[PDB]
Amino acid sequence: HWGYGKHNGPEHWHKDFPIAKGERQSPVDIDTHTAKYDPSLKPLSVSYDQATSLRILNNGHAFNVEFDDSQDKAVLKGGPLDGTYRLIQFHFHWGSLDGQGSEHTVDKKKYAAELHLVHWNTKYGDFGKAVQQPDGLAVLGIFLKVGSAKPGLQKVVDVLDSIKTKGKSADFTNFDPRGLLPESLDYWTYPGSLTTPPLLECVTWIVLKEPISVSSEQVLKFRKLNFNGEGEPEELMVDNWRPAQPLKNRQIKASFK
Ligand SMILES: [Zn+2]
């Protein structure tokens, strides 16, 4: 099965998922000097005030904080998007060391981690239908650098010991994802894909320019998670990031000068 090891990592994924070599794969390097300011891009609208978190799950590749997406409660709109996209889950990608971990890069710079807030286009009715469409998902990507702690991340960090291994889940209600956002919503945007198999080319990527700061202690606790299940040999959940993929015939647009 696919993963992030030497024998099943990103360079192998194309054998089971040929779209891995497709025309709009993610992540990508964001060349800040080549990204063009697009004055027709609108400000992002992130409306998370009624968000209903439910559960946190170790799925063997990351941990997902899942939300109730059966109603328009936490939605992303505006920016490059047409229509309304409902928050379904967030997760992170991170490194074994502070010098790597992000999926997107900025002028080849790798951040310590990257948060993905995953939303699906309500015009397709559910997430499974949305991923079959070129405009089915909108993922808000936020870089993490190591410095001061992020207070709004700590509730996530403190439950991780209860979902150490693949397949474990825990109740995770009343979590407010507004506490994970930076001050500015300036962003880059481009058409791309899921960054894990099945690598479907269904994502409008919206990557915020401003990173959030998290503490060394916070990210160290991410790195104590396991890819393996309980009672299997321990393999630390680290370096669960796909490297940058060819940009091909795409333009990255900036919302800001
Ligand atoms: Zn992701």
Side-chain angles (χ1 to χ4, degrees), residues 91 93 103 116 195:
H91 62 271
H93 304 262
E103 295 205 304
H116 290 162
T195 64

Side-chain angles (χ1 to χ4, degrees), residues 4 62 64 89-93 103 114-118 139 194-196 205 240:
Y4 296 97
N64 290 359
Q89 53 106 329
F90 72 76
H91 62 271
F92 303 81
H93 304 262
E103 295 205 304
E114 186 174 331
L115 164 62
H116 290 162
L117 295 131
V118 182
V139 185
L194 315 181
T195 64
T196 54
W205 277 95
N240 62 346

